[PDB]
Amino acid sequence: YYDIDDVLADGTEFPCKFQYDIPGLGYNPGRPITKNTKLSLPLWLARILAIVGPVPFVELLPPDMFSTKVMNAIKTDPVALDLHSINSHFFSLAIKWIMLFSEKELANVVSELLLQRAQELNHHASSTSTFLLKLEEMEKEIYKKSHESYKDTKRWMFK
Amino acid sequence: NTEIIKSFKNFILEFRLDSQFIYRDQLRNNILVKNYSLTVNMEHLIGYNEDIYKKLSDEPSDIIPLFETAITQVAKRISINSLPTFQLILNSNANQIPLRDLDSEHVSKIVRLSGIIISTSVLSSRATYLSIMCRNCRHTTSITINNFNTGNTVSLPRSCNCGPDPYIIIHESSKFIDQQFLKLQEIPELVPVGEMPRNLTMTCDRYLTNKVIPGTRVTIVGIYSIYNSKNSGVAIRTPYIKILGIQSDVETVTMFTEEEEEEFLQLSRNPKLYEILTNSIAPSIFGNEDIKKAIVCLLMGGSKKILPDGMRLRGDINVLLLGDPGTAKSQLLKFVEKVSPIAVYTSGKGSSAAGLTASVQRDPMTREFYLEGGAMVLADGGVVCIDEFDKMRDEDRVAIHEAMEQQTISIAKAGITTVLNSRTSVLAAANPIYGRYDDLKSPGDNIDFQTTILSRFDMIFIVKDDHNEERDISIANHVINIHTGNANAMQNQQEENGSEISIEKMKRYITYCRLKCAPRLSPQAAEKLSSNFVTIRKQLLINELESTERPITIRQLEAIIRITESLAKLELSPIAQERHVDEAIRLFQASTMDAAS
Amino acid sequence: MYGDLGNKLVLEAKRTKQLYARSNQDVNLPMYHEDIIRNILKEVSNLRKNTEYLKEQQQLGMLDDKVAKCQYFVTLLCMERNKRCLLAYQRLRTDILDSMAWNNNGLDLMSSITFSQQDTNNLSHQEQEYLKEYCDLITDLKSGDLVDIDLSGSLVPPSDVFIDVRVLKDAGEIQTEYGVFNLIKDSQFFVRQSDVERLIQQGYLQKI
Amino acid sequence: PDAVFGDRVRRFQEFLDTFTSYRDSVRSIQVYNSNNAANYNILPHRIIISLDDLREFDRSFWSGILVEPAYFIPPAEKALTDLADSMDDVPHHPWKLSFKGSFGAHALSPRTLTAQHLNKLVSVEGIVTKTSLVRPKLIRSVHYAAKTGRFHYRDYTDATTTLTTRIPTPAIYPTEDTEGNKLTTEYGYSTFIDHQRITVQEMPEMAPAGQLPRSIDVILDDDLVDKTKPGDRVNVVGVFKSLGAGGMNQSNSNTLIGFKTLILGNTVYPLHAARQMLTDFDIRNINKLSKKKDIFDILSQSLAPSIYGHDHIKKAILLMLMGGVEKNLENGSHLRGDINILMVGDPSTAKSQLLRFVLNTASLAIATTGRGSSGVGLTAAVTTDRETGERRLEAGAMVLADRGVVCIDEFDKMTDVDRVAIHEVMEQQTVTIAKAGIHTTLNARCSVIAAANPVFGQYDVNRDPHQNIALPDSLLSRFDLLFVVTDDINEIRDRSISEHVLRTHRVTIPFLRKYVQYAKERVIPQLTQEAINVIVKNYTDLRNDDNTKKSPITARTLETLIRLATAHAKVRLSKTVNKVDAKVAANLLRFALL
Amino acid sequence: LPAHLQQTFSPEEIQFIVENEPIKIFPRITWQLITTDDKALNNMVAMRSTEVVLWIALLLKQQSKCSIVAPQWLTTKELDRKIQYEKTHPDRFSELPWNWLVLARILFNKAKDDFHDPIHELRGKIQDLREIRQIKVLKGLKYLNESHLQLDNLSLLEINELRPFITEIMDKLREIHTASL
Numbered sequence A: 001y002y003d004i005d006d007v008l009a010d011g012t013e014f015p016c017k018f019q020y021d022i023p024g025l026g027y028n029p030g031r032p033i034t035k036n037t038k039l040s041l042p043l044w045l046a047r048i049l050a051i052v053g054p055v056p057f058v059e060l061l062p063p064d065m066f067s068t069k070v071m072n073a074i075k076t077d078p079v080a081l082d083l084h085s086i087n088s089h090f091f092s093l094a095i096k097w098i099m100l101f102s103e104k105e106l107a108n109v110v111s112e113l114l115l116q117r118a119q120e121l122n123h124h125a126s127s128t129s130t131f132l133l134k135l136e137e138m139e140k141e142i143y144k145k146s147h148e149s150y151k152d153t154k155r156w157m158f159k
Numbered sequence B: 001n002t003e004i005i006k007s008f009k010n011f012i013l014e015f016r017l018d019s020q021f022i023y024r025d026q027l028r029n030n031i032l033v034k035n036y037s038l039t040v041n042m043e044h045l046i047g048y049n050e051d052i053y054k055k056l057s058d059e060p061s062d063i064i065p066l067f068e069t070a071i072t073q074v075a076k077r078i079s080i081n082s083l084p085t086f087q088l089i090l091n092s093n094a095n096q097i098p099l100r101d102l103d104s105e106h107v108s109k110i111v112r113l114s115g116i117i118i119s120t121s122v123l124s125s126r127a128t129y130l131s132i133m134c135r136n137c138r139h140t141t142s143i144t145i146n147n148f149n150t151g152n153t154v155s156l157p158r159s160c161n162c163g164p165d166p167y168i169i170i171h172e173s174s175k176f177i178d179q180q181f182l183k184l185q186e187i188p189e190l191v192p193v194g195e196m197p198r199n200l201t202m203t204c205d206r207y208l209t210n211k212v213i214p215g216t217r218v219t220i221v222g223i224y225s226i227y228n229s230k231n232s233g234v235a236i237r238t239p240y241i242k243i244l245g246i247q248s249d250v251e252t253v254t255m256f257t258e259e260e261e262e263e264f265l266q267l268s269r270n271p272k273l274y275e276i277l278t279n280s281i282a283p284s285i286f287g288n289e290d291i292k293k294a295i296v297c298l299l300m301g302g303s304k305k306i307l308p309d310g311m312r313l314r315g316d317i318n319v320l321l322l323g324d325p326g327t328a329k330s331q332l333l334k335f336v337e338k339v340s341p342i343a344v345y346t347s348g349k350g351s352s353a354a355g356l357t358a359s360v361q362r363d364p365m366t367r368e369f370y371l372e373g374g375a376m377v378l379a380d381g382g383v384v385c386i387d388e389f390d391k392m393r394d395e396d397r398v399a400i401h402e403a404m405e406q407q408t409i410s411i412a413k414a415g416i417t418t419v420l421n422s423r424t425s426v427l428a429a430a431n432p433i434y435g436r437y438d439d440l441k442s443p444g445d446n447i448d449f450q451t452t453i454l455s456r457f458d459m460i461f462i463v464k465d466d467h468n469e470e471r472d473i474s475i476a477n478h479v480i481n482i483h484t485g486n487a488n489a490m491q492n493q494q495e496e497n498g499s500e501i502s503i504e505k506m507k508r509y510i511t512y513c514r515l516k517c518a519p520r521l522s523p524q525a526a527e528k529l530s531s532n533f534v535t536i537r538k539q540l541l542i543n544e545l546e547s548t549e550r551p552i553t554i555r556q557l558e559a560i561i562r563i564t565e566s567l568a569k570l571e572l573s574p575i576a577q578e579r580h581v582d583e584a585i586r587l588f589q590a591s592t593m594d595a596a597s
Numbered sequence C: 001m002y003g004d005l006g007n008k009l010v011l012e013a014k015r016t017k018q019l020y021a022r023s024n025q026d027v028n029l030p031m032y033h034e035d036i037i038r039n040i041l042k043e044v045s046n047l048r049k050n051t052e053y054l055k056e057q058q059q060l061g062m063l064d065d066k067v068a069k070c071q072y073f074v075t076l077l078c079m080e081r082n083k084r085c086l087l088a089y090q091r092l093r094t095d096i097l098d099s100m101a102w103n104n105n106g107l108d109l110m111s112s113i114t115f116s117q118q119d120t121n122n123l124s125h126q127e128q129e130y131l132k133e134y135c136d137l138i139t140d141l142k143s144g145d146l147v148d149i150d151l152s153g154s155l156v157p158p159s160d161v162f163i164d165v166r167v168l169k170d171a172g173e174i175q176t177e178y179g180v181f182n183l184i185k186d187s188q189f190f191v192r193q194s195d196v197e198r199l200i201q202q203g204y205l206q207k208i
Numbered sequence D: 001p002d003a004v005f006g007d008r009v010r011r012f013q014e015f016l017d018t019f020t021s022y023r024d025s026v027r028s029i030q031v032y033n034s035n036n037a038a039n040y041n042i043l044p045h046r047i048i049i050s051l052d053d054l055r056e057f058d059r060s061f062w063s064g065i066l067v068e069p070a071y072f073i074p075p076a077e078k079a080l081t082d083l084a085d086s087m088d089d090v091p092h093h094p095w096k097l098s099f100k101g102s103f104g105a106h107a108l109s110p111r112t113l114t115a116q117h118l119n120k121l122v123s124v125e126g127i128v129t130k131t132s133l134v135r136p137k138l139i140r141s142v143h144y145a146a147k148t149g150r151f152h153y154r155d156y157t158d159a160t161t162t163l164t165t166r167i168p169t170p171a172i173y174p175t176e177d178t179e180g181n182k183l184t185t186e187y188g189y190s191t192f193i194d195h196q197r198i199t200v201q202e203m204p205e206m207a208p209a210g211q212l213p214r215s216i217d218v219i220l221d222d223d224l225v226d227k228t229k230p231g232d233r234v235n236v237v238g239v240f241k242s243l244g245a246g247g248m249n250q251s252n253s254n255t256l257i258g259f260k261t262l263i264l265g266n267t268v269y270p271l272h273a274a275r276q277m278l279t280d281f282d283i284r285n286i287n288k289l290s291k292k293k294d295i296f297d298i299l300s301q302s303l304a305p306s307i308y309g310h311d312h313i314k315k316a317i318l319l320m321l322m323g324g325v326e327k328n329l330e331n332g333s334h335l336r337g338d339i340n341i342l343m344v345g346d347p348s349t350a351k352s353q354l355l356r357f358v359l360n361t362a363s364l365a366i367a368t369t370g371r372g373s374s375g376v377g378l379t380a381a382v383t384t385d386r387e388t389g390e391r392r393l394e395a396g397a398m399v400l401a402d403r404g405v406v407c408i409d410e411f412d413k414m415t416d417v418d419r420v421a422i423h424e425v426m427e428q429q430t431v432t433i434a435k436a437g438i439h440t441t442l443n444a445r446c447s448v449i450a451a452a453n454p455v456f457g458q459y460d461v462n463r464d465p466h467q468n469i470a471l472p473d474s475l476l477s478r479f480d481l482l483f484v485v486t487d488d489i490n491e492i493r494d495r496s497i498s499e500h501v502l503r504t505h506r507v508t509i510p511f512l513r514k515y516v517q518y519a520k521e522r523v524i525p526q527l528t529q530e531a532i533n534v535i536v537k538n539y540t541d542l543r544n545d546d547n548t549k550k551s552p553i554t555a556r557t558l559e560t561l562i563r564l565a566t567a568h569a570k571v572r573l574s575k576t577v578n579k580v581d582a583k584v585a586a587n588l589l590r591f592a593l594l
Numbered sequence E: 001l002p003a004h005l006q007q008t009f010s011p012e013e014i015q016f017i018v019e020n021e022p023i024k025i026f027p028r029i030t031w032q033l034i035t036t037d038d039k040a041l042n043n044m045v046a047m048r049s050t051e052v053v054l055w056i057a058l059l060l061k062q063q064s065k066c067s068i069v070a071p072q073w074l075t076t077k078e079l080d081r082k083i084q085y086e087k088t089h090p091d092r093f094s095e096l097p098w099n100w101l102v103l104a105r106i107l108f109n110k111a112k113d114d115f116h117d118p119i120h121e122l123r124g125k126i127q128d129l130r131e132i133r134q135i136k137v138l139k140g141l142k143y144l145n146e147s148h149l150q151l152d153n154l155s156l157l158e159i160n161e162l163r164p165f166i167t168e169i170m171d172k173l174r175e176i177h178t179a180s181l
């Protein structure tokens, strides 16, 4: 698949900095970029630039506010949370985070989250200015199939 | 007695029309997402329910909740403890005796009202499940208080072997329901002789509260029971309604069904909307094509930017209509009132322009100064409409200068100083200095001294009086068809059902299309309007050197960009284009020339 | 910054899916964004002549410097990052006209794929030769079956053998095979099952 | 008790590890308070329990605190206070809690009340505008039989224990215990506590437009009284609680609620959307950019990111907002050390634009909208009887203006009765009033920002530049800067405007608010003979050129001419009044006058 | 190329696999059937059973020359004993006819006016049993482990209704479990 769901999800930004000083700039004069300078990085190049060197080039700093000031909020009540305005996806960004990181700490704690969100979703499936709908919209695709199954299954079962 | 209970638990688990098994098929659907509520439907409920109501009419105030104990006992059958009690919602429709027959044969019978709700109180609490302690003997019991005869259905007795009235209300194991005391007002059209309208009071339960905003048409069905307050002659009491269910019309908070939007998308792909509305908006208006297009863009509006800094832009447009008497600027304004979601109509004499926005007064309880009234705070999201902008000089201009252009007032009267929000949209229709002389002299003499209001509004029409001998005779042919014969009421009903749009369809899709899409104009248009303005200012600049003064300043240039954003809300496209924007200036280029001649 | 227009390119690609796949089968595919893809065809042109300068200096200037190797990677990576989107929008374009090509693959005057979206019927006229190369290929798949099996429609299973069907919006005399049914205007039938399958998908009969 | 006490004791062994990191903290805070009190020749009992130490490893004990918060908190106190004595008993007041953390979806905006969580933990935010009185209250008085020398003991329970609805004691003070001894009471060993109610409005931006703001109220205790100035973005957390008898205490009880909403809470916090602690890093960088000799100009251009030009206006706002000092005269009247600028301009020329975004970075300076009811600087003797026998001079609008800024509009579109009030508060820092009560001189450090419009359209050039608004010169003489905004039409000027509005329908702010609020805490030079020698020469030539030209200036204008340069050195963050500051002060007035 | 309903069955063919099962009739009539799975008989005798496939018998009922016998568990005195073995056993469902829900809906179109008093009793005694199954299914999925389930007695219909969501939740959590190591 050409992956139209997440090719934009790697289009999002990500703040990290350098370890070396490189004259390769495309961001606009002053072609030497000084080291340890915090730069907004798109996920695609930044994923492999933290790999290619021994010592890689980009200082991968963790955006630990996407670690510590939300691990607490999801370790309390997984019912109505801001899962969305902090990150327009919470799923593949968590996937491609853990591939470089490989730490089972938060890899346990979102595994608690999903079944709890799923526990709402099935038994929410039988049949307002800016922020609110997309709480109800990141869940949409995941169940847009599901209640459309229940919709026809009544319409055969009755007359 | 009891056993009625057995006549209904053995009745709602099987009532159906032909093989759909509906009430279990919705209660199951209603215990899941938490609402805990019912409705009733048609006739046999009526057919034998009168045979129950011939033993419920005697007191439909205590054995109405004898329904309520039943459905909990069918609820636990669909569970297998955290189980609340339920509520009821009714339906009935034959007519509406407005406010006439209200003491003789209507104590504790089912009534139906049509009114306009005006005033909401703050919430409160009464209990429904308590726990009770005897003082020195320490008895423990629990009493439930379900339906009412306001307070004091039953009291607390003296028997625990401890002393008299030893009973106290703990707050550890208690539930609560909320009441309203919202006030109802008579719809001002049904009983005209010479009278002034009256008013009643009512309460409700929590799973039907906060469902109304002030300024709406509404209908309601409920009881007409009587309380007795001891804060006037013999022992007289007062009337009030105990409501049951508001099967209202629309809200006029964006949840609705899906087949509504299906036709809307099926209509919005046909690209004839801009021309077909101008015939179908006002079925009683001869032409007036430049003015008519200004109204549809006024009703929907643009957007609002809270862009990542401190300040903000104002996403709205505000028009004026000044001209000779007999050019239908008046009766056009009643026409926007019914079609708007929220509309008020205060169009006359300003009505004490300091008391237009805010009022404070002493209080019957605690002698306090709190905020009560306003014409603007009622009218947010929608459109107001006023007139007579010649003979108000007192406070009408000093009250709208702050109310417009930033839409952020704060009252600094004796109590609070709070910046309450406002997102209003104004409209006015004045007279010039008897019309003809302002079109037969130097083009001044419109407002008595100041033009500073005129820079605050962008769109200005200046109509006039021609003498074209073929357009009047059609008009004289027009209005006799609409006065008597009512043949165009049969004609426009004949072009309705495939080509035109009635009034009740226009209202519902405007609130849908505004509250879904969010436009933005394309950067290819940025070269277009910039090249437009520099000669527009120059056309003004060539006029000032000829000793011709007055008014154009830069609010209009940031008003055209809202105008071109307006039809983008109409087409519901997330961009804006060039055939989009060239028709937009074609409305405003026409209104630049009349600003000079 | 770099692949920014491709982000909003694939963003409006998301709208084309949700328009079709939620409402109904009737596609009315919007437009091809030649104006949008000409912008990224301009940036890929400027980016390509950027690296051949450093391909020219890597033997003469910095002398295959480690900095220059990373400077090749950003120019390498931003190419293919752009390359990922521009075909993905290209595939989701062509993976929905096939559904138009399948359901009306020839049932009644096939090569009349006219009276159909004239503002985009010149757009997909460059894709018509792609489209008809489905249509030519779908013909020999109909004939290359060693027995006669229908491949044009009839996807819902049959239930009964007698179905009341009404007609409207149609005239003339059709159905020369399987016995002529003599279609007059606004007159219902009461027939067997297998005949009307080639006419309901044709869209002449209306209600089951 | 065994069932209701067992999970107390099992918690009594559980939470002792949940203060492994606080059992140091709770004794370190008192050992010096025990020390300094013995060598004078002070803090309450705050034990902040986080969520984290009670959610990582207890679940049954957890959700009891967020479902039934009535059988758990006096367990947590009683097991706390023994650790106070088991740690500290050798040297010769209950230590209640605060409970900070997150909550997981209990940010009930009080426009909404709850059906789910009544009698539970609630997090509430908003603004307070009531600020009622303070009044002590007894909890325990000790009696003493003066004959036979023996003592007694008595505690009074009330609606203040926050949780247990005990049998009340409808009594004030008893006499004659079961003896023939006249009872004596020791008041030094009788303990007291205070009691203060405050009403909280709604944050009037996130409540959607269908209603006026609503309100509820909260009873707090001594530990955070006088912390709540009226006009603070406060955020409280406490228990939800009903009290009062509804339906039985009077008979027939028809349509009378008897269930008052109360919050018996703890631990308020001011928020900001005064306490901004910065590290060594940012405090050093702000000195590092202080080393540049251009940063007065960069701050001018980095303020209003929408509007072209007006750099004379733009430097003035940041000069005014940061503020110039007033050195009070010892046994003498202090002078004006406030600064008070004014604007006027022909309409739609961004005169009200920059007036509303000074309120976002205001640093606790909440202004009005200039609606000129009597109350702009006064009280109007509003007491509301304050529970039958208390009369209070309720603060109208100057308790918010103190060491802050205000802004009001529409001067000529006002009556007379506000203009007499703005006379007093400008010539004098204080108002003093005796309406039906007490003469009281309460102090105020204010600084107005003005906005008016000319009367007769575009008539400024063809007539006198003066009298152009003709409001009384009592204020014009008390003001200094009358910027007259031009709107001249040039084809390169407007073309530049046209794209810049268009480019924005789609050096930082929080660093800027730190820099000024750090610069209110640095020392004030005032002292260099060199800079005072040049400015008086700079005065004298225009003292020859004020009277034969446009506008006569006075001696108080010299007190500006120190004050602008005095604040201009506050931008420099130095203690030497340089020379370079005196050149921008002269040049700013030269555009203001010519 | 359906591209519409691919990952599961539509509800119109789940009846198609069950209609090809045989039941018993009471024939009436007297070459006849050469339908490649036929067992045509001679002049057929009434008052006797015969295992006949379903879909031809529904067609044989429209011309109305035969009659149907209900299967042996379709009395109200039989279904009651099913509701007791489950109400004492909240662990799972006990005893299942395996195609019961789709079997009744075919049986209520001129296959209901033949049997001895089933109206106002049978739809009573079925629609209760549908939800009691699905109340049981709501407690089960909350207990979801990794990659191992226990569904013992489910109708084919709920299998067509639990299907299109139960995959991609456990599949998406299969990633974060496996890509963690």
Ligand SMILES: Nc1ncnc2c1ncn2[C@@H]1O[C@H](COP(=O)(O)OP(=O)(O)OP(=O)(O)O)[C@@H](O)[C@H]1O
Pocket (backbone or CB within 6 Å): B284, B285, B286, B287, B288, B323, B324, B325, B326, B327, B328, B329, B330, B331, B479
């Ligand atoms: N262009 C028009 N098309 C249809 N009807 C019109 C038009 N202009 C006026 N009328 C009719 O005039 C009738 C009475 O309107 P009226 O005479 O009150 O206007 P008016 O209020 O005097 O105008 P003005 O507001 O300028 O004073 C209405 O029934 C309306 O139908």
Ligand SMILES: Nc1ncnc2c1ncn2[C@@H]1O[C@H](COP(=O)(O)OP(=O)(O)OP(=O)(O)O)[C@@H](O)[C@H]1O
Pocket (backbone or CB within 6 Å): B312, B313, B405, B554, B555, B558, D306, D307, D308, D346, D347, D348, D349, D350, D351, D352, D353, D354, D453, D497, D501
């Ligand atoms: N001189 C200016 N330069 C740039 N933009 C301006 C200027 N004047 C007005 N604008 C634009 O016009 C909009 C509103 O201006 P504003 O309403 O503040 O005028 P005003 O200061 O209120 O005048 P008045 O008080 O007389 O109504 C702003 O969004 C701003 O971008």
